[PDB]
C-alpha cells in the first residue's frame, strides 16, 4: 500500500493507520494496540516485553495458518503515533530474531531512514529524559542474549511469567539462568507473613536460589530466608544514586562465588528496577560483553523499567571497566566480612600476595 | 506461540 | 531573563539560547533575534548520507553565533538558532549546536542531550555514504559522546584549528585528505602516469612538512610508491578488496606498525581508493584499541572530521569486533622481533607468542 | 576566538 514497509515481499508488511483498514482479496490487516497494553511506570512507553511478544506470536500464527488467508499478504499495523509505531516495529523485529532466526542487519534494513522516524525509548524515572536507546540497541541486545543461551522460547511459560509479575505474588522476574530481580518483601514487624512474601519464599526454595542481595533499607527480617538455608547480604546504597565501584566489585565477586556453586542470585531494591539493574547489568557486561545500551534493552525486554535516570549514563561511562576486570581482577582467596564471608573481586597483585605467607 | 511455527525465514542471498 | 514559549522551540539556556524549526520566516522583536545558516553552511552528500555537519561547518557556525551574541542591539534578547522543518535538517542543526556546547562551552553529554530527548517529531538518525540500502544508524547521542571523548583525550583542539587549511586539502585538486588526529592522516589514493600532477605534489609537500613517516596503501596500485620512498617515507601495502572487511591478521599488522611509528613521534598516512571505507576500518580499530571509544562513537568522531568514513557492512563489523580491539591491550603484546610483512616494524602478537620469544632469548 | 560569550552550563 502507501505508508507500508516490506519485511517479506508478498507476505509480511508493517503499516501505520489512524483508521481500521478493510481486508481485500490480497491483503489481511491486524493490530494488537487495543489488546496488548504496555503498563507505564511514569513516561516510559516501551518496548513491549517477552510476554507481550509471545501473545503477539500466537495471534500472528493464527492469521498465517488460517486457510482464508492462504493467498494474501499480512499487514501488521499501529496508529500513527511515533511511540506506538516504535513499539509495533520493535516487537516485529524481536519476533523475527527470536522465532525465525533472522540476524540484526536483516531486521534493521526495512526500518532504516523511515520518515517520520520512530520515537526512541526513554527510562521509567521522574526526571526529564536525558538518555535514549533505539530499536537497533534492543535488537542487538535480544539477539546477543539469545546467542549466549539466555533466552529459551521453547521453555517459556507465559502463565508463570505473568503470574509472578503481579505485586500480590511477589513482583519478580527470572532474568537469566543465574539471576532473579524482585521488589523488596515487606512485613508488619521487621524488627503470619503476607501472600507475596510466602509466594517469594516458596518459589526461591524450589528454584535453587542460594543468595539474596538487599540494596535498600530494611523492610523485612532476613531470618525468613536464612531459616530455609538461603544466604542474605546487604550491599545497601541510596535510592536514585549510582553505586561506588567498590560496591560493584563486591557484588560481582559474590555472584561469581554462588554461580560456581551452581546457585542463583536474587537481587532486590525497593522496586527491583534501578539500583538492581546497575549491579545485575554490570555482571552481564562483565560476563557476556553486551554494550551498555544492549544490556539496558535486554533487561527491559524481560522486566520493564530497569536502570533509572542517571544510572543509564553511569552504566554507559563504566562499561569498559566491567569488561577490563576479566583480565585485571580475580576472586579473593580471603573472605570479606563486607559480603558475609563471600569473596570480592581483587587486583592480580593482591591475589598473588594471598598465595604466600606474609612474613 | 513459540512452538510449531510457520516458515518465515530470511531468503538466502549468495556469498 | 524570562523564559520564551514558542511552538517548535527548544530551550538550551533560559532567556538566552533556543533551537527552533519553522516552515515560515520568523520576525525579530524587541525580545528575540532569529538566525538560520542553511543557505551558508551545507553538507555535501556522497549518495544518501545527509550529516552530521563537520568540524569546519561547526567552526563557521561558532563565528556567526558569536557575532550575533556580541552585537550591542541583542544585549537584552534571546537568540533563536533555527532550521526548516525537515527531520534531516533538524538533526543537523541540533547536533551542530550540541557539538558547539561541548567544544566551546565545556558542557557534558548529559547536559546537551536533555533538551533534545523525546522531541516530537523525532530527529532523523544518521546513515552511511554507500550505495546499498541503509541497515545501520548512529544518533545525536553517539556523535556527542564521540566528540566529547575525543576532546577529553586531546584529539580535538578548536583553539588551534586552521579552517583555511582544513577546507583546502579536502578538495580533490589538492589531494583529498584530512588530518584526523595528531597521529593519523586519511587520504584518497594518488594517481599518475609513470611529471607529477598538482594533487600528488600537494600531498608530497604537506607530508614532508608535517612529519609523516609511514604511508599505508589498502587498494590496487594507481601510482609508483618510489615517490614516497625518495623523500624518506616508508611505504607499506596491506591491500584488501573494495567493500570488504579486513581479516584480523591484517588489523594486527596495521596496529603494530602504527604503534612502532607513534613511539618515534611520527604520523601514519593511510589511503584506500577514496580514503573512507577500508581506511576507516583500520584507523577506527586503532582508535578503539587506544582510547576505548564505542564503535558508534568512533564512527561519529571519524565522520565529524571526514564525512563518509566506514561504509555499509564495515559498520556492523566494527560494532561486532569493538570488544576484541579494546581488549587487545590485555590479550596481545607488541612483538620483540621485527617482521618482514610490515617492512621491519613490530606486529601485535598473542601473549603466548610473546612469552615464547622471551623464553628463546 | 578572543571574545567567547559566557554560555557555560549553570
Ligand atoms: Zn611517477
XYZ file of C-alpha atoms and ligand atoms in Angstrom:
746
model
C 0.000 0.000 0.000
C 1.151 3.562 0.836
C 2.865 4.043 4.231
C 3.874 0.392 4.478
C 7.304 -1.127 4.992
C 8.102 -4.505 3.384
C 9.605 -7.262 5.566
C 8.964 -10.233 3.197
C 7.743 -9.481 -0.332
C 4.145 -10.630 -0.857
C 3.665 -11.916 2.694
C 4.678 -9.643 5.677
C 4.344 -5.813 5.861
C 4.275 -3.177 8.674
C 1.738 -0.310 8.347
C 0.560 2.753 10.324
C -3.084 3.976 10.042
C -5.460 6.085 12.144
C -8.454 4.146 10.712
C -9.295 0.447 10.504
C -8.290 -0.772 7.006
C -10.631 -3.135 5.170
C -9.341 -6.584 4.219
C -9.181 -7.287 0.463
C -8.766 -10.405 -1.697
C -4.930 -9.957 -1.485
C -4.406 -8.312 1.951
C -5.393 -9.067 5.564
C -4.727 -6.396 8.253
C -4.397 -6.798 12.031
C -3.394 -4.720 15.078
C -2.798 -5.552 18.758
C -2.641 -1.919 20.043
C -6.124 -2.241 21.610
C -5.480 -5.676 23.215
C -1.797 -5.986 24.274
C -1.006 -2.950 26.535
C 2.306 -1.570 27.897
C 1.887 -0.718 31.634
C 3.870 2.532 32.072
C 5.593 3.500 35.382
C 5.753 7.234 34.558
C 6.501 8.436 30.963
C 8.186 5.278 29.654
C 6.112 3.789 26.820
C 8.007 0.609 25.688
C 9.478 -1.547 24.376
C 6.989 -4.395 24.654
C 8.222 -7.293 26.801
C 8.762 -11.030 26.134
C 5.246 -11.962 27.371
C 3.721 -9.361 25.007
C 5.852 -10.869 22.200
C 4.567 -14.380 22.997
C 0.926 -13.158 22.872
C 1.637 -11.380 19.535
C 3.188 -14.592 18.100
C 0.069 -16.660 18.970
C -2.171 -14.122 17.203
C 0.138 -13.733 14.157
C 0.404 -17.525 13.692
C -3.415 -17.931 13.837
C -3.777 -15.425 10.972
C -0.957 -17.027 8.894
C -2.364 -20.556 9.335
C -5.988 -19.603 8.533
C -6.879 -21.107 5.098
C -8.906 -17.985 4.198
C -5.564 -16.054 4.147
C -3.606 -18.598 2.033
C -3.107 -16.232 -0.916
C -2.801 -12.943 0.997
C -0.014 -10.786 2.410
C -0.381 -9.968 6.121
C -0.113 -6.281 7.195
C 0.593 -5.772 10.922
C -0.230 -2.150 11.882
C -0.468 0.507 14.672
C -1.864 4.044 14.784
C 0.292 6.955 13.537
C 1.754 7.800 16.973
C 5.598 7.762 16.802
C 5.604 5.906 20.174
C 3.051 3.211 19.097
C 4.869 2.787 15.738
C 8.168 2.234 17.661
C 6.531 -0.480 19.833
C 4.971 -2.325 16.847
C 8.182 -2.168 14.799
C 10.412 -3.299 17.707
C 8.043 -6.203 18.561
C 8.005 -7.432 14.907
C 11.853 -7.273 14.802
C 12.101 -9.219 18.115
C 9.714 -11.822 16.633
C 11.937 -12.332 13.544
C 15.178 -12.536 15.621
C 13.781 -14.974 18.188
C 11.235 -17.118 16.266
C 12.568 -17.024 12.644
C 16.385 -16.822 13.181
C 16.916 -13.546 11.303
C 20.087 -11.522 12.073
C 20.242 -7.837 13.206
C 21.180 -6.321 9.833
C 18.306 -8.300 8.194
C 15.574 -6.985 10.559
C 17.009 -3.420 10.684
C 17.169 -2.748 6.891
C 13.333 -2.253 6.496
C 13.284 0.313 9.381
C 16.274 2.470 8.395
C 15.669 6.127 7.424
C 11.856 5.923 7.742
C 10.094 9.292 7.773
C 8.726 10.282 10.195
C 11.231 8.458 12.452
C 10.330 6.170 15.361
C 10.364 7.646 18.908
C 13.489 6.407 20.807
C 12.820 4.626 24.138
C 13.156 6.504 27.484
C 13.542 5.418 31.117
C 10.873 4.943 33.851
C 12.059 7.575 36.387
C 10.754 11.028 37.419
C 13.343 13.422 35.931
C 13.370 14.851 32.422
C 14.722 12.307 29.957
C 18.425 12.673 29.046
C 19.393 9.216 27.636
C 17.779 7.154 24.852
C 18.050 3.611 23.484
C 16.994 2.699 19.940
C 15.381 -0.251 18.129
C 18.913 -1.112 16.887
C 20.116 -1.302 20.544
C 17.162 -3.520 21.616
C 17.519 -5.847 18.583
C 21.283 -6.316 19.072
C 20.813 -6.932 22.834
C 17.984 -9.507 22.437
C 19.959 -11.226 19.601
C 23.169 -11.386 21.708
C 21.230 -12.728 24.696
C 19.744 -15.498 22.516
C 23.191 -16.332 21.076
C 24.583 -16.686 24.661
C 21.771 -19.079 25.742
C 19.929 -16.608 27.999
C 16.531 -16.704 26.154
C 14.821 -20.096 25.586
C 11.455 -19.638 23.890
C 10.924 -23.402 23.791
C 10.542 -23.497 27.589
C 8.908 -20.066 28.003
C 5.802 -20.379 30.174
C 3.501 -17.390 29.737
C 1.286 -18.353 32.704
C 4.228 -18.326 35.146
C 5.767 -15.186 33.627
C 2.571 -13.132 34.022
C 1.669 -14.541 37.464
C 4.865 -13.619 39.299
C 4.970 -10.079 37.826
C 1.897 -9.204 39.955
C 2.536 -7.360 43.247
C 0.356 -9.798 45.200
C 2.559 -12.726 44.041
C 5.915 -11.030 44.689
C 6.662 -8.756 41.660
C 9.640 -10.647 40.304
C 11.143 -11.928 37.017
C 13.706 -14.647 36.333
C 16.092 -12.694 34.076
C 18.670 -15.396 33.165
C 19.604 -18.898 34.448
C 21.673 -17.157 37.179
C 19.597 -14.091 38.273
C 16.174 -13.047 39.672
C 15.166 -9.336 40.054
C 12.379 -8.558 42.565
C 10.751 -5.867 44.662
C 11.514 -5.815 48.405
C 9.303 -8.045 50.599
C 7.514 -6.211 53.443
C 6.148 -7.305 56.807
C 4.281 -5.530 59.607
C 7.055 -6.085 62.220
C 10.525 -6.195 60.586
C 12.409 -5.681 63.889
C 1.849 -14.826 59.589
C 3.554 -13.355 56.504
C 1.556 -11.827 53.663
C 0.750 -13.597 50.387
C 3.533 -12.008 48.240
C 6.189 -12.921 50.839
C 5.044 -16.571 51.084
C 4.978 -16.681 47.259
C 8.610 -15.462 47.001
C 9.807 -17.881 49.724
C 8.159 -20.869 48.037
C 9.477 -20.037 44.528
C 13.038 -19.400 45.786
C 13.078 -22.637 47.827
C 12.018 -24.630 44.746
C 14.216 -22.901 42.114
C 17.725 -23.131 43.722
C 18.113 -19.533 44.943
C 21.185 -19.592 47.207
C 21.841 -15.851 47.874
C 19.557 -12.830 48.368
C 21.166 -9.363 47.943
C 19.339 -6.398 49.555
C 20.107 -2.922 48.207
C 17.533 -0.829 50.148
C 16.665 -0.141 53.762
C 15.269 -2.952 55.918
C 11.552 -3.673 55.372
C 11.612 -7.379 56.460
C 13.567 -9.688 58.767
C 16.240 -11.600 56.788
C 15.709 -14.649 59.086
C 12.834 -15.786 56.840
C 15.391 -16.510 54.086
C 18.120 -17.799 56.383
C 15.596 -20.220 58.076
C 15.415 -22.139 54.764
C 19.148 -22.108 54.050
C 19.422 -19.051 51.750
C 22.344 -16.684 52.453
C 21.444 -12.970 52.842
C 23.725 -9.999 52.068
C 23.310 -6.212 52.386
C 25.038 -4.021 49.765
C 22.842 -1.014 50.507
C 23.120 2.340 48.707
C 20.771 5.340 48.463
C 17.637 5.257 46.284
C 18.262 7.065 42.956
C 22.078 7.115 43.192
C 24.848 5.205 41.465
C 26.976 2.652 43.376
C 30.691 3.153 44.066
C 32.874 0.733 42.072
C 33.857 -0.917 45.363
C 30.208 -1.999 45.847
C 30.141 -3.293 42.225
C 33.355 -5.314 42.746
C 31.898 -6.778 45.960
C 28.695 -7.742 44.126
C 30.428 -9.322 41.133
C 32.697 -11.430 43.379
C 29.742 -12.640 45.477
C 27.678 -13.516 42.363
C 30.644 -15.412 40.801
C 31.098 -17.352 44.093
C 27.435 -18.512 44.030
C 27.422 -19.268 40.265
C 30.485 -21.518 40.751
C 28.403 -23.476 43.307
C 25.556 -23.849 40.762
C 23.182 -21.435 42.510
C 21.020 -18.470 41.569
C 21.217 -14.931 42.999
C 18.030 -12.929 43.701
C 18.522 -9.112 43.909
C 16.054 -6.530 45.240
C 15.990 -2.816 45.978
C 12.719 -1.026 46.746
C 11.184 -1.748 43.316
C 13.802 -4.145 41.859
C 14.412 -1.712 38.910
C 17.073 0.997 39.234
C 19.647 0.038 41.820
C 19.140 -3.684 40.967
C 19.793 -3.064 37.238
C 23.113 -1.288 37.997
C 24.515 -4.413 39.671
C 22.997 -7.190 37.525
C 23.763 -5.045 34.420
C 27.432 -4.720 35.387
C 27.733 -8.516 35.822
C 26.059 -9.196 32.444
C 28.555 -6.852 30.694
C 31.487 -8.422 32.627
C 30.364 -11.963 31.608
C 28.934 -11.657 28.075
C 30.236 -8.417 26.528
C 26.947 -6.550 25.931
C 27.256 -2.822 25.195
C 25.628 -0.690 27.936
C 22.735 0.141 25.570
C 22.215 -3.540 24.632
C 22.237 -4.527 28.323
C 19.573 -1.939 29.192
C 17.456 -3.103 26.201
C 17.695 -6.811 27.080
C 16.930 -6.149 30.791
C 13.819 -4.069 29.903
C 12.618 -6.695 27.398
C 12.334 -9.155 30.355
C 11.476 -6.682 33.159
C 10.222 -3.213 32.026
C 11.620 -0.140 33.762
C 15.092 -1.390 34.827
C 18.052 1.136 35.050
C 16.605 4.545 36.056
C 17.707 8.130 35.472
C 21.441 8.931 35.977
C 22.096 5.166 36.286
C 21.904 4.955 32.428
C 24.793 7.385 31.815
C 26.683 5.658 34.716
C 26.426 2.188 33.062
C 27.439 3.759 29.709
C 30.536 5.505 31.171
C 31.733 2.413 33.143
C 31.099 -0.447 30.621
C 34.840 -0.588 29.694
C 35.743 -1.014 33.399
C 33.409 -4.046 33.784
C 34.963 -5.773 30.746
C 38.565 -4.902 31.829
C 38.000 -6.738 35.124
C 38.006 -10.127 33.367
C 41.774 -9.547 32.859
C 42.801 -7.314 35.795
C 40.971 -8.995 38.750
C 40.405 -12.380 40.423
C 38.042 -13.634 43.116
C 39.634 -13.078 46.556
C 41.047 -16.149 48.300
C 40.344 -14.403 51.650
C 36.833 -13.603 52.871
C 35.487 -10.116 53.342
C 33.117 -9.506 56.247
C 31.514 -6.853 53.999
C 29.894 -9.616 51.891
C 29.204 -12.099 54.758
C 32.171 -14.353 54.115
C 31.985 -14.264 50.317
C 34.907 -13.231 48.182
C 35.076 -9.823 46.366
C 36.939 -9.129 43.106
C 40.566 -8.007 43.912
C 43.601 -6.986 41.798
C 46.027 -9.502 40.264
C 48.796 -8.200 42.513
C 46.698 -8.654 45.662
C 45.758 -12.196 44.547
C 49.418 -13.123 44.019
C 50.262 -11.981 47.542
C 47.396 -14.003 49.060
C 49.004 -17.279 47.846
C 52.114 -16.558 50.022
C 52.701 -16.254 53.780
C 53.096 -12.573 54.793
C 56.405 -12.681 56.711
C 3.232 -19.123 20.417
C 6.857 -20.231 20.174
C 6.280 -23.952 19.285
C 5.232 -25.459 15.887
C 5.777 -22.348 13.823
C 5.147 -21.069 10.229
C 8.149 -20.741 7.910
C 9.187 -17.054 7.535
C 12.948 -17.272 7.312
C 15.023 -14.586 5.603
C 15.628 -15.529 1.935
C 19.036 -16.929 1.060
C 21.390 -14.433 -0.591
C 24.594 -15.563 -2.338
C 28.088 -15.489 -0.751
C 15.783 36.861 31.968
C 12.374 35.422 31.100
C 11.629 32.082 29.502
C 10.359 32.130 25.894
C 7.328 29.999 24.958
C 7.001 29.452 21.208
C 5.811 26.446 19.193
C 8.543 24.085 17.890
C 11.203 25.876 20.002
C 13.542 24.082 22.483
C 15.254 25.808 25.464
C 19.020 25.412 25.902
C 19.657 28.433 28.220
C 16.691 30.320 29.764
C 16.138 33.687 28.093
C 19.299 33.443 26.007
C 19.686 30.362 23.670
C 16.870 28.468 21.833
C 16.679 25.912 18.962
C 13.721 26.407 16.548
C 12.326 24.523 13.491
C 9.956 26.504 11.258
C 8.304 26.354 7.838
C 7.949 30.192 7.843
C 10.497 33.001 8.258
C 10.300 34.381 11.829
C 10.461 38.128 12.544
C 12.873 39.675 15.063
C 11.304 41.573 18.000
C 12.457 43.705 20.919
C 12.919 40.434 22.835
C 14.022 37.936 20.131
C 16.673 37.668 17.386
C 16.467 34.730 14.957
C 19.065 33.205 12.608
C 19.494 30.258 10.253
C 22.693 29.129 8.450
C 21.076 26.708 5.974
C 21.886 28.917 2.943
C 25.526 29.439 4.024
C 26.678 26.184 5.689
C 25.671 22.963 3.987
C 26.578 19.293 3.828
C 27.793 17.759 0.516
C 26.238 14.296 0.116
C 28.090 11.341 -1.481
C 24.876 9.336 -2.041
C 22.015 9.420 0.530
C 24.101 10.452 3.590
C 22.977 13.905 4.831
C 25.040 14.621 8.010
C 26.323 15.195 10.625
C 27.872 18.582 9.927
C 31.684 18.503 10.133
C 34.300 20.400 12.271
C 34.786 23.130 9.605
C 30.996 23.737 9.444
C 30.971 23.910 13.284
C 33.828 26.449 13.312
C 31.988 28.697 10.831
C 28.737 28.352 12.854
C 30.645 29.448 16.006
C 31.910 32.663 14.276
C 28.335 33.598 13.170
C 26.764 32.719 16.552
C 29.368 34.834 18.421
C 28.861 37.808 16.048
C 25.126 37.782 16.807
C 25.557 37.228 20.572
C 28.148 40.052 20.804
C 26.096 42.601 18.795
C 25.069 45.502 21.118
C 21.465 45.589 19.868
C 20.962 41.962 21.024
C 22.206 42.576 24.579
C 18.759 42.071 26.128
C 17.437 39.496 23.652
C 17.168 35.737 23.475
C 18.991 34.246 20.463
C 16.970 31.632 18.475
C 19.044 29.417 16.117
C 16.696 27.617 13.679
C 16.313 25.200 10.717
C 13.493 24.239 8.355
C 11.021 21.533 9.440
C 12.579 18.531 7.699
C 13.726 15.816 10.111
C 17.160 15.651 8.384
C 17.799 19.443 8.595
C 16.565 19.418 12.222
C 19.062 16.610 13.109
C 21.954 18.557 11.551
C 21.129 21.845 13.334
C 20.558 20.160 16.752
C 23.745 18.046 16.508
C 25.840 21.074 15.466
C 24.542 23.184 18.404
C 25.370 20.292 20.800
C 28.910 19.959 19.358
C 29.301 23.755 19.870
C 28.331 23.477 23.574
C 30.735 20.514 24.102
C 33.793 22.046 22.338
C 33.417 25.797 23.099
C 31.429 25.981 26.375
C 32.622 22.834 28.283
C 29.162 21.213 28.601
C 28.976 17.455 29.199
C 26.928 14.951 27.135
C 24.018 14.590 29.535
C 23.681 18.427 29.745
C 23.477 18.892 25.926
C 21.207 15.814 25.350
C 18.461 16.702 27.884
C 16.770 19.422 25.709
C 16.602 17.020 22.718
C 15.246 13.860 24.370
C 11.708 12.706 23.405
C 11.105 15.587 20.979
C 8.143 15.005 18.636
C 8.546 14.511 15.736
C 11.914 12.822 16.334
C 15.205 13.684 14.601
C 16.276 11.569 11.570
C 19.178 9.216 12.620
C 22.383 9.428 10.514
C 23.169 6.839 7.771
C 26.313 5.856 5.831
C 27.606 7.133 2.419
C 27.414 3.884 0.400
C 25.111 2.594 -2.364
C 23.321 -0.334 -0.588
C 20.052 0.175 1.376
C 20.841 1.529 4.848
C 20.917 -1.037 7.700
C 22.873 0.712 10.499
C 22.279 4.098 12.153
C 24.107 6.371 14.594
C 22.326 9.012 16.737
C 22.964 12.515 18.089
C 23.784 10.789 21.431
C 26.510 8.663 19.682
C 28.028 11.694 17.885
C 28.025 13.903 21.031
C 29.658 11.211 23.149
C 32.307 10.509 20.435
C 33.205 14.206 20.005
C 33.296 14.748 23.805
C 35.548 11.689 24.345
C 37.868 12.784 21.510
C 38.174 16.256 23.109
C 38.903 14.701 26.571
C 41.717 12.542 25.082
C 43.340 15.592 23.414
C 42.364 14.791 19.788
C 40.289 17.956 19.026
C 41.524 21.492 19.837
C 39.421 24.306 18.395
C 41.863 26.898 19.752
C 44.462 25.783 17.204
C 42.129 24.669 14.362
C 43.077 26.105 10.924
C 39.885 26.484 8.824
C 41.618 27.543 5.581
C 43.963 24.514 5.678
C 41.076 22.136 6.512
C 38.884 23.409 3.618
C 41.768 23.461 1.116
C 43.035 19.922 1.413
C 39.584 18.242 1.428
C 39.328 19.233 -2.276
C 40.249 16.639 -4.922
C 42.590 19.026 -6.704
C 44.804 19.426 -3.544
C 44.895 15.728 -2.525
C 41.532 14.892 -0.831
C 42.784 14.327 2.720
C 42.161 15.248 6.353
C 44.397 15.202 9.383
C 42.218 13.129 11.750
C 44.352 13.163 14.958
C 47.940 14.076 15.922
C 48.911 10.567 14.779
C 46.845 9.909 11.584
C 46.027 11.279 8.103
C 43.336 9.668 5.900
C 43.514 10.333 2.133
C 42.314 9.198 -1.323
C 44.839 7.256 -3.462
C 47.155 9.436 -5.591
C 47.194 8.781 -9.354
C 49.835 9.135 -12.026
C 51.036 8.143 -15.491
C 54.546 6.890 -14.653
C 55.540 14.824 -14.472
C 53.560 14.628 -11.172
C 50.080 16.197 -11.153
C 49.018 19.026 -8.812
C 47.289 16.889 -6.126
C 50.211 14.430 -5.867
C 52.645 17.336 -5.495
C 50.315 18.856 -2.884
C 50.286 15.593 -0.860
C 54.068 15.076 -1.063
C 54.732 18.676 0.097
C 52.295 18.501 3.061
C 53.609 15.052 4.153
C 57.278 16.272 4.005
C 56.386 19.362 6.124
C 54.195 17.514 8.745
C 56.368 14.566 9.903
C 54.639 11.687 8.044
C 56.958 8.659 8.467
C 54.791 5.786 7.081
C 52.284 5.560 4.178
C 49.916 2.524 4.158
C 48.170 1.629 0.830
C 44.988 -0.533 1.068
C 43.825 -0.537 -2.614
C 45.126 -1.695 -6.034
C 48.141 0.198 -7.475
C 47.438 3.560 -9.177
C 50.922 5.087 -8.730
C 54.597 4.191 -8.198
C 55.489 4.006 -4.467
C 59.035 5.311 -5.160
C 57.771 8.932 -4.948
C 57.218 8.485 -1.203
C 60.441 6.492 -0.608
C 62.511 9.171 -2.404
C 61.605 11.703 0.328
C 62.384 9.301 3.132
C 58.891 7.981 3.951
C 58.424 4.219 4.437
C 55.741 2.701 2.141
C 53.678 -0.416 3.082
C 50.949 -2.363 1.229
C 48.167 -4.017 3.301
C 45.760 -4.423 0.367
C 42.234 -5.879 0.666
C 39.196 -5.905 -1.658
C 36.895 -2.880 -2.142
C 33.812 -3.006 0.097
C 35.123 -5.875 2.304
C 36.217 -6.050 5.935
C 39.871 -6.869 6.692
C 40.989 -10.180 8.240
C 42.111 -9.695 11.859
C 45.647 -10.735 10.746
C 45.791 -7.518 8.650
C 44.404 -5.429 11.576
C 47.058 -6.765 13.996
C 49.856 -5.991 11.490
C 48.460 -2.467 10.997
C 48.122 -1.740 14.729
C 51.709 -2.875 15.467
C 53.067 -0.858 12.529
C 51.234 2.278 13.809
C 52.412 1.713 17.405
C 56.045 1.453 16.164
C 55.861 4.787 14.290
C 53.921 6.614 17.067
C 56.640 5.548 19.549
C 59.074 7.527 17.302
C 56.844 10.620 17.250
C 55.825 10.189 13.566
C 52.480 10.312 11.749
C 50.907 7.492 9.698
C 49.052 8.430 6.467
C 46.560 5.712 5.287
C 44.779 5.534 1.910
C 42.397 3.266 0.026
C 40.629 4.382 -3.204
C 38.529 7.140 -1.550
C 40.048 7.150 1.940
C 36.640 6.327 3.503
C 35.692 2.628 3.972
C 38.810 0.431 4.160
C 40.835 3.277 5.732
C 38.054 3.782 8.347
C 38.202 0.073 9.315
C 41.922 0.182 10.220
C 42.158 3.668 11.761
C 38.903 3.003 13.678
C 40.272 -0.276 15.106
C 43.393 1.598 16.334
C 41.311 4.408 17.946
C 39.168 1.856 19.839
C 42.306 -0.076 20.977
C 43.966 3.156 22.170
C 41.170 5.316 23.639
C 38.190 2.941 24.348
C 35.530 4.532 22.095
C 32.369 2.581 21.487
C 32.044 1.553 17.789
C 29.211 4.098 17.283
C 31.262 6.930 18.961
C 34.244 6.045 16.775
C 32.151 6.218 13.552
C 30.647 9.555 14.712
C 34.043 11.158 15.572
C 35.607 9.931 12.256
C 32.716 11.443 10.209
C 32.825 14.720 12.190
C 36.370 15.228 10.794
C 35.999 13.364 7.424
C 32.412 12.797 6.265
C 31.525 9.363 4.826
C 34.072 7.100 6.611
C 33.125 3.395 7.382
C 30.791 2.105 4.622
C 27.986 -0.470 4.563
C 28.796 -3.815 6.251
C 32.032 -2.315 7.713
C 29.764 -0.553 10.277
C 28.367 -3.852 11.645
C 31.924 -5.329 11.525
C 33.359 -2.518 13.690
C 30.338 -2.909 16.026
C 30.834 -6.675 16.432
C 34.651 -6.518 16.917
C 34.875 -3.479 19.293
C 35.459 -5.690 22.381
C 38.255 -7.564 20.531
C 40.069 -4.281 19.678
C 39.710 -2.715 23.108
C 40.780 -5.859 24.974
C 43.881 -6.448 22.815
C 45.518 -4.174 25.433
C 45.291 -7.306 27.683
C 45.333 -10.236 25.199
C 48.244 -9.162 22.901
C 51.674 -7.527 23.133
C 53.916 -5.739 20.628
C 56.481 -8.307 19.321
C 60.156 -8.170 20.366
C 61.112 -9.211 16.806
C 60.714 -7.185 13.556
C 58.500 -8.578 10.774
C 59.126 -8.530 7.018
C 55.336 -8.389 6.434
C 55.408 -4.768 7.702
C 58.828 -3.698 6.434
C 60.722 -4.315 9.660
C 58.212 -2.727 12.079
C 56.898 -4.768 15.069
C 53.496 -6.536 14.823
C 50.914 -7.263 17.527
C 51.174 -10.908 18.679
C 49.418 -13.100 21.256
C 50.519 -13.215 24.910
C 51.700 -16.792 24.309
C 53.867 -15.937 21.287
C 55.342 -13.066 23.322
C 56.117 -15.465 26.199
C 57.909 -17.902 23.873
C 60.018 -15.078 22.339
C 61.249 -14.174 25.820
C 61.913 -17.869 26.557
C 64.084 -18.290 23.437
C 66.076 -15.064 24.022
C 38.275 33.235 19.483
C 39.031 36.374 21.553
C 35.558 37.251 22.868
C 33.894 33.895 23.659
C 30.476 34.659 25.203
C 29.829 33.230 28.699
C 27.371 30.372 27.949
C 28.603 27.813 30.498
C 26.099 25.344 31.968
C 24.562 26.943 35.141
Zn 55.677 8.694 -11.369
